[PDB]
Amino acid sequence: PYTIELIQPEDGEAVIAMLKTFFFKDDPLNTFLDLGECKELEKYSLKPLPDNCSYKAVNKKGEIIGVFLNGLMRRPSPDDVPEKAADSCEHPKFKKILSLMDHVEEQFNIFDVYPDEELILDGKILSVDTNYRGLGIAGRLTERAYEYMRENGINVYHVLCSSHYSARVMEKLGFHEVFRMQFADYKPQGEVVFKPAAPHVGIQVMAKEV
Ligand SMILES: CC(C)(COP(=O)(O)OP(=O)(O)OC[C@H]1O[C@@H](n2cnc3c(N)ncnc32)[C@H](O)[C@@H]1OP(=O)(O)O)[C@@H](O)C(=O)NCCC(=O)NCCS
Ligand SMILES: CC(=O)NCCc1ccc(O)c(O)c1
Known part of the structure; x- marks a missing residue:
């Protein structure tokens, strides 16, 4: 028996405490790198x-x-000056993750897929307590966002997944792949950076039109 509720500003510390226990340790990229203490990821999670x-x-x-932290994302302005998130990150391990994100965005712009959309919902951080996994909580968190989308005329929900394992969860919820990149093919300076277990495969960007 659980509720799904809007995260309030006063919830920031509790959200971070939960993420530090789970996501910071058990997202496949974080575990691969042994992320450790990471104030940059705390900042990243609090932003939306x-x-x-x-x-x-x-x-x-x-x-x-469990949490699903989402933020609104806007089509780049005609006069946009694109920036690399990794450039302002001092934490060397988190910089690798941000660099991967920057690379994905350099290769694939979700706004090209949906030329008529100005605002898209971006699912940024999804994490469920281990003892409550496999109960459909990820789905119930995700589907609460559809309510917000309906209330605000948002059509597209975009979720970058860090493993095929989590992309499959999104597929079950009615999302489809819009971009993929194998870890084995991500070689920004000529060499592989991420080498988690084979079943993870790589990143998949998933989308749903609601
Ligand atoms: C991805 C994650 C949020 C899924 O949350 P969830 O609420 O457990 O999602 P689901 O209930 O749909 O379970 C997903 C699958 O996990 C598997 N599963 C079943 N029981 C499980 C358990 N006790 N523990 C872990 N996984 C279990 C099943 O394959 C299940 O799919 P199915 O129920 O359709 O057969 C959760 O695994 C998690 O926090 N992972 C670590 C962080 C992460 O990778 N976040 C996503 C980044 S994109
Ligand atoms: C929907 C979701 O939770 N995507 C996660 C992407 C991500 C973000 C930050 C990290 O530190 C990390 O390992 C992975």
């Missing part, structure tokens, strides 16, 4: 909260057992 479309799953004791 004021967009008022991030959700927490909360158990009967009032503990956060």
Whole structure:
């Protein structure tokens, strides 16, 4: 028995405490790198909260057992000056993750897929407590966002997945692949950076039109 609720500003510390226990340790990229203490990822996770479309799953004791942090994403302006997120990151391990994100964006622009859309919902951080996995919480978190999308005329939900394992969860929820890149093919300076276990494969960007 759990609720799905909007994450409030006062929830920031509790959200971070939960992510530090789970996501920071068990997202496949974070585990591969042994991310450790990472204030940059705390900052990254807190950023979308004021967009008022991030959700927490909360158990009967009032503990956060899952989150899906989402932010609105806008089509680059005609006069856009594109920036690399990695350039302002001092944490060397998190810089590798941000560099991977920058690389994906250099190769693939979600706004090219949907030329008529100005605003898209971006699913940024998805994490469920281990003891509550396999119960459909990820799906219930995701589907709460559809409510927000309906209320605001947003058609597209975009979610970059860090493993085929989580891309499959999104597929079950009605998302489809829009871009993929194998870890074995990600060689920004000529050499492989990420080498997690074979079943992870690589990143897949997933999208749903609601
Ligand atoms: C990805 C994640 C959020 C999924 O959350 P979830 O609420 O467990 O999602 P689901 O209930 O749909 O379960 C997904 C699959 O996990 C498997 N599963 C079943 N029981 C499980 C358990 N006790 N523990 C882990 N996985 C389990 C099943 O394959 C299940 O699919 P199915 O129920 O359709 O057969 C969760 O695994 C997680 O936090 N992973 C680590 C962080 C991460 O990778 N986040 C996503 C980044 S894109
Ligand atoms: C939908 C989702 O949770 N995507 C995760 C992408 C990501 C973000 C930050 C990290 O540190 C990381 O390993 C992976």
